[PDB]
Each structure stands twice: as structure tokens, then as C-alpha cells.
Assembly symmetry: D2
Homo-oligomer: 60 residues x 4
């Protein structure tokens, strides 16, 4: 009786901890992806500007 | 007796499924990050080349 | 009489050659700028795509 | 006599002005190329950094 309860408690703690670990890692990679989003946006804007200027120079 | 076992089985199935879901999502975001790695590498190489040529033109 | 004509011919040849040189250099730098145009265009398209995918991954 | 001198003066003024024009345009395109140099340098540095961080996230 007691041993069954104990074993089950340890199984629950195992899955719980593995789940918290995956949660944390997923938060980390999600943050990194957000950073990549911002950076990509900035770079796109900057290259589009540089292209505009480049074309003003090519036209004139 | 029986109801306790059943309830515990449902708890285990819950944590199990949530864990599999986090596993899958984490695999997805990891793959995306790998893609970003490759792409960043390529872009770095290409810009360094374009710079080299740009500097040959500026020197000559 | 003769020396004046000769001197003037050499002046004309000087300005002519300097002008041809500037013409050639300007063609070179213009070609390089065109290359930069194409490259910038490609890079803009590629980064916009990578952003689209990144956002599909962030949304799902 | 006089007309020959005048005509030659106009030829010299023509080549002179065309030469000054090519000089100015070449300065413009050279400045633009310098801007492109700086920008390319910055972008290379930034992408290399973003790659470093991306790889720290992938390693941990
Ligand atoms: Cl729990
Ligand atoms: Cl795990
Ligand atoms: Cl929790
Ligand atoms: Cl299990
Ligand atoms: Cl979840
Ligand atoms: Cl499994
Ligand atoms: Cl001529
Ligand atoms: Cl010159
Ligand atoms: Cl000619
Ligand atoms: Cl002169
Ligand atoms: Cl011209
Ligand atoms: Cl002058």
C-alpha cells in the first residue's frame, strides 16, 4: 500500500520536473526567436533604405 | 481503491501528454533556429565577399 | 605659328585622355553600384521570407 | 587667325566642362560606395554577433 503511493509520487515528480525543464527551454528558444524577429525587421528596413539611396544615386 | 488508481492514471496521462506537446514544440523551434543558423552563415559569407569586391573597386 | 598649333594639340590630347580615364572609372563604379543593387534586392527578399517563416513558427 | 583661336578656346572649354562633370559624378558615386562599405561592415559584425548568440542558445 505505502510503497505503491510512494512510487507513484516519484513518477509524478519525474514527469513534473521534466515538464518544467521543457517549459524553461521552450521559453528560452522562444525569446531567442523574438530577438531574431526584431533584428530581421530592422535589417529589412535598413537595406530597403540603402537601396532607395543607391537608386537615387544611380538615377541622378 | 479503484477510483484512486484511475485518478492517478489520468494524472499521469495528463502530464505525459503535456510533456509530449512541449517536446514537439521545442523540436519545431529548434529546427527553425537551425535554419536561422545556416541562413546567417550564408549571408555573412556573401556580405564579406561583396565587401572584398567593393574594396577592390575602391582601391583600383 | 607651328609651335602654337602643336602645343594646342597636346593640350587637347591631355584633356581628351583625362576625360576618357574618368569615363572608364565612372563606368566601373557604376557597374559595381548595379551589382550592389541586385544583391540588396535579393537580400531584402530573402530576409522578408525568413521573417514570414519565423512568424509562422512564432504563431503556431 | 582670330576665328581659329576662338574655336580652339571653345573646344578647350568643352572638354574642360565635360571633364569637371565626370569628376563630380565620380566623386558622388565614390562617396556612395564608401557609405556601402561602412554599412556592409556594420551588418557583417551584427550578423556574426547574432550567430554567436544563436549558437549559445543552441548549445545550452
Ligand atoms: Cl502537478
Ligand atoms: Cl527532456
Ligand atoms: Cl508548475
Ligand atoms: Cl511514462
Ligand atoms: Cl503547456
Ligand atoms: Cl514517449
Ligand atoms: Cl575630341
Ligand atoms: Cl583625373
Ligand atoms: Cl572618344
Ligand atoms: Cl585647363
Ligand atoms: Cl559625359
Ligand atoms: Cl579645374
Amino acid at each position: 500500500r505505502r510503497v505503491r503511493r510512494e512510487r507513484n509520487k516519484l513518477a509524478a515528480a519525474k514527469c513534473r520536473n521534466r515538464r518544467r525543464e521543457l517549459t524553461d527551454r521552450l521559453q528560452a528558444e522562444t525569446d531567442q526567436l523574438e530577438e531574431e524577429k526584431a533584428e530581421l525587421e530592422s535589417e529589412i528596413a535598413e537595406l530597403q533604405k540603402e537601396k532607395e539611396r543607391l537608386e537615387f544615386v544611380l538615377v541622378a
